[PDB]
Symmetry: D3
Subunit: 251 residues, 6 copies
């Protein structure tokens, strides 16, 4: 069978039922090459797709683009082609003083500051990961030697006002989001990103297994501009971790 | 030095406890406490019966919540004022999936917020999620008891009747919001209904408290057969054995 | 035949079609003994049930527990057993400076700060008492010599943040409820409690008659935490209101 | 002193009135005023016609509201600026219960807020509830007139057509929110539909003003969609007697 | 043959008109009608005064709406039942932007739905948007008059007082939703407040009817100076001249 | 050097451009740029490919948005930080009206906000509407190309599948909110579906930026999902010529 956007067929996946889904198309090859026999399948729009083999089993690596909407297309179309387990890796900004740049976060639930999640389940439904995937991600992250936090992630449809950034063209933030950083901090939320609410809600309500692991590249209470060597090390460890989490999920 | 308004206990009464087991039914409090060492009755007011006990040398509180988020929210708050930081809920549930059997255990990984009290702690966007350590301890304890364990989403309703799409009622009416809702939750993979977890999990996850929920399955909306009496007795006993073992794992 | 939670049958109620529904199971016997031939029927969880006779007619007294959810179960199961009129009594915190401890309030409508009401009617629907019950409660309260206020009650699913209390473990209140006590005060709301929105909405949308009378035990302009007489007077009033509802 | 922006009257014009009767139709204002003593025309602008009269020696205002919450909210606000504290709404209505007959009276004990203006005074959780004294006076006046009187909940809609689930319309369609709504309100025991009570009652109950509504039934929606003389005449006699009871 | 319930007119009374000019004030109806040929009084009931006239030989209806979406919705519906398909709203307005002057005209490109009646036609997500041809005709007519014309967003409120964040009122109270709202709309570029456009535009755009709104500015929430009688008289007269010219441009 | 977080370009790179053409697909950026003078590649990062070109002597930037409001919102914000004030969206769309044929063009006059990002700029009541000059320019350019052009409302969804009521999916399920929604939008006169306009139009209209959307119809949902290749190619080629001519009209 074919799909509308991803440009791959079921045959291209060689029986893969697990996908690693980074955001950045450029990260796809980097992840694939941590496994055996990486093969470029397709690139169209924000969707770059590779296959590789992990302990003899086919695994697909597919970028999502930025945001719930583009993520939702990739997950749906991969599911049409037989994928049932989705491991999200990406970078994130921490909002708690105790979470340091270079730490890792495994999301136990997401604050749904998105729109696409509502296209799968009403707001009352929890944006939570599959327990096996979260468990595998925690184990892989801890085994790497990283400092790992389990907790709630705020997942926003914007990078700017929905994360209460004021250093912008207008410098304004709509009422809903004024004072919101402080509120999430007080409620113990660890970090911000832009895809987990959609991913987790879609999967948890559709019989798909999903989880999210992230490297902390900035801390909002500190500075916006990351140090290059620190960022590189964090990014490299994250992709090693997500591949090990995939290994733990294979049956 | 204060005595909290509803529970009628003081901090000193808890002998340093930082963990509470919180069943719904006041009559179950003594039953849980007696699985531990040196159980002592502290107080009973309204739906709140409170005992203390000792588990591997550490003080633990057992406190009933009553039915529903509102009465649960009072117990959790007043215990937190007195130093309790971890809350392990144990209780009965009805399953709504055919693959879940009477006698099985469910550990909630997140709750559908069909309640009102959760909104008094966090807006609806916030996830009603357990602490990961508590959920992990509950899964391990449940598996070690020999039970079949399901991890998944629980629908947490402010009513027993229309919010669980029951029609066998005085009016036989279910408001628009809840018509067809059972099938919707079933199709979304929800395991069960109960009436306190959304409040508990949202309150704790947004307030720096650790919480989780484990439940023995005593009825299944999709199975017409009458649950076996012996199985029910065994399930009640196993549930509370499991929650005490989960507490042991949290205090280690 | 025997309802799921309350542990009583229709026969146990001896034809009663009116219930007095306090919150605390311990107050059930106290109310029943204000009437004739009180009989203990059952106790389970927060639900203690008695029957008694008032001017020769059977009346039920049944506790609700705290909150809309446990209240909704009691009302439903009593209705299954033939009860059609529900008189809520309890205590409350006033938020207006002119409403004093010891005064009584009869709710004319509730601010729906609960969840269970939404399981019976959408938010647009008014949480309002049956007019005959409200009329009987006002008459009973006034005839007792009490100072009586008719007005709006804020009915909250929490005792703490939803009533904008800050002497709490977190010492914080979510955005929705920050500044809310002053807002309700400005809007003329009289008091806070925790069951009326559920009770009134459920009954007004289900062909049941309900109302709420409450004795004031704290004024929130004075302090947050409450410290016998007000309770005793309140239950005498609700029994007289029941007398007025009997046909 | 000031002349209010829309109503075109001053506080002095009202001769100390603290109670207003507020029908919808400007043409009804003189008809209500003439049931009292010394009626005098004060002003007419847009849908707002204003008279003063005397009832048992006390000044009373009669002021039309126009159709809907928005125009009602202006009249109530401006009258309150000029000292009015009690508002008695009279009008006609469509019943949705089969046992409520044309010619019956309804006194609203609470309104379903199917309007927008109520939200400009209180959030949706707040009850659209009358003042208890006004509702009590209206019930007594209605009964004393010999009318069959119903106390209960009224659905108060910002539209006459889709919000009252009428289908004999240009589009013949009703938006999702209102499809099946008449049956739902019927099942919930709602008595009737009209268009101003949610705004009036919410505004007043949240602003330290006393308000109530009484209405004569001119159609039963179990019978037909499209709808009077004797019902209107009896309704205004009733509201004037309710006013008398409030001034005593 | 039927006579519509509120407006008190029949289809035959409209003499084939498919376009209506809909001012708010019943007293303005005759004034607009007299700008055209052969004006004829049809009916007056409540806030609804109805005239017919002829514009370049074609029948045009002029019908007042009263204040607010609810009364407007009745007029539009009943006129549509009688064959009217195009609705041109005219009035005068204040403005909330300092660059908009008394005497300028505003053509609404979209409305902030601070009303209730719009929701009786379409859910809140739906845009309160004019028909493009009507908006185009109104802009052309307004500009041809020599006035400075602003195309932009209008805030359409179910109240004159709290929904426009007015504090000079009986209570001085503005509910939370509307506290700080004026500044918010100003910062978002909203031009003005009025009380009917959200209902009108949403109703029509979701019902196969063509609608638009044009207004002369009579006050500005942000300027010190008070406009003189002459400017206001000129603005009122220009607004109705403009709407009649917009009608001319819409005729086929 | 003024820099931005995602786009990888500086203000200097844009050579004073105040207008951007913003297609969805990065591959379409060079195709649009080459219709103008001196196109130069600036950067490519993630879904964002950026070129500069010159149109009648004025610098213009072409920048892809990616799929969806969230990625669109980043591009628009960062371009605005670098001085861009006018945004012309071009793309493809699926029509839902039987009278709107494959190969026609649509200029959006307002969007149904079935997205989340719009709410991060303005509450739901605010209209997702284009700048009137941009919409006018797009209509003229589209007409001048010989296309059949429709002006009207567009449904703008955060999903391609359930939010557009597609059932031929992995689960075959559509959440309650969206069941029956296609028919509802059809009945309300909505022309088409796409996934970025609600965010774009709301963000810009509430932030002092001018925006509009023009689209070629590549499928009609009442017909078939699989486009014919030659027809699609013709439609896509015409759309990019049209958006460049609309830009010319805006800069005149
Ligand atoms: C990397 C990153 C940082 C940040 O602050 N927010 C989001 O969404 N992503
Ligand atoms: C035990 C049980 C069963 C059921 O179906 N629902 C709830 O809340 N509890
Ligand atoms: C007795 C009481 C007092 C108070 O302040 N609030 C509630 O809910 N109950
Ligand atoms: C008179 C009347 C009748 C009816 O059915 N609805 C409304 O609003 N008014
Ligand atoms: C004339 C005018 C002015 C203003 O400020 N608001 C409304 O609705 N109308
Ligand atoms: C091209 C296209 C077609 C369609 O049906 N929907 C969306 O969003 N885009
Ligand atoms: Cl990434
Ligand atoms: Cl229990
Ligand atoms: Cl009590
Ligand atoms: Cl009643
Ligand atoms: Cl006190
Ligand atoms: Cl009238
Ligand atoms: Cl009839
Ligand atoms: Cl006018
Ligand atoms: Cl006439
Ligand atoms: Cl249009
Ligand atoms: Cl594109
Ligand atoms: Cl091309
Ligand atoms: Mg602000
Ligand atoms: Mg799952
Ligand atoms: Mg005690
Ligand atoms: Mg239904
Ligand atoms: Mg936590
Ligand atoms: Mg705050
Ligand atoms: Mg009733
Ligand atoms: Mg008697
Ligand atoms: Mg027809
Ligand atoms: Mg429908
Ligand atoms: Mg009052
Ligand atoms: Mg405030
Ligand atoms: Mg249209
Ligand atoms: Mg055709
Ligand atoms: Mg065709
Ligand atoms: Mg359905
Ligand atoms: Na994207
Ligand atoms: Na309870
Ligand atoms: Na209709
Ligand atoms: Na009006």
């Amino acid at each position: 069978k074919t799909v509308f956007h991803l440009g791959v067929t079921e045959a291209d996946l060689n029986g893969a039922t697990l996908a690693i889904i980074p955001g950045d198309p450029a990260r796809v090859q980097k992840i694939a090459e941590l496994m055996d026999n990486p093969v470029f399948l397709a690139s169209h729009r924000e969707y770059t797709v590779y296959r590789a083999e992990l302990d003899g089993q086919s695994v697909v690596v597919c970028s999502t683009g930025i945001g719930g909407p583009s993520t939702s297309i990739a997950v749906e179309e991969l599911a049409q082609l037989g994928v049932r387990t989705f491991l999200r890796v990406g970078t994130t900004g921490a909002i708690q003083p105790h979470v340091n740049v270079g730490d890792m976060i495994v999301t136990t639930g997401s604050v749904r500051l998105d729109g696409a999640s509502l296209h799968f389940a009403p707001m009352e439904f929890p944006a939570v990961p599959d327990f096996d995937v979260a468990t595998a991600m925690k184990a892989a992250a801890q085994e790497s030697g990283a400092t790992v936090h389990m907790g709630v992630t705020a997942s926003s449809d914007t990078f700017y006002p929905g994360q209460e950034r004021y250093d912008t063209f207008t410098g304004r933030v709509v009422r809903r989001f004024q004072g919101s950083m402080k509120e999430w901090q007080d409620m113990g939320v660890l970090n911000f990103e832009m895809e987990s609410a959609t991913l987790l809600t879609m999967c948890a309500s559709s019989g798909l297994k999903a989880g999210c692991v992230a490297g902390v590249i900035i801390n909002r209470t500190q500075k916006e501009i990351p140090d290059h060597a620190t960022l590189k090390e964090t990014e490299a460890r994250s992709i090693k971790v997500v591949v090990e989490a995939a290994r733990k999920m294979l049956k």
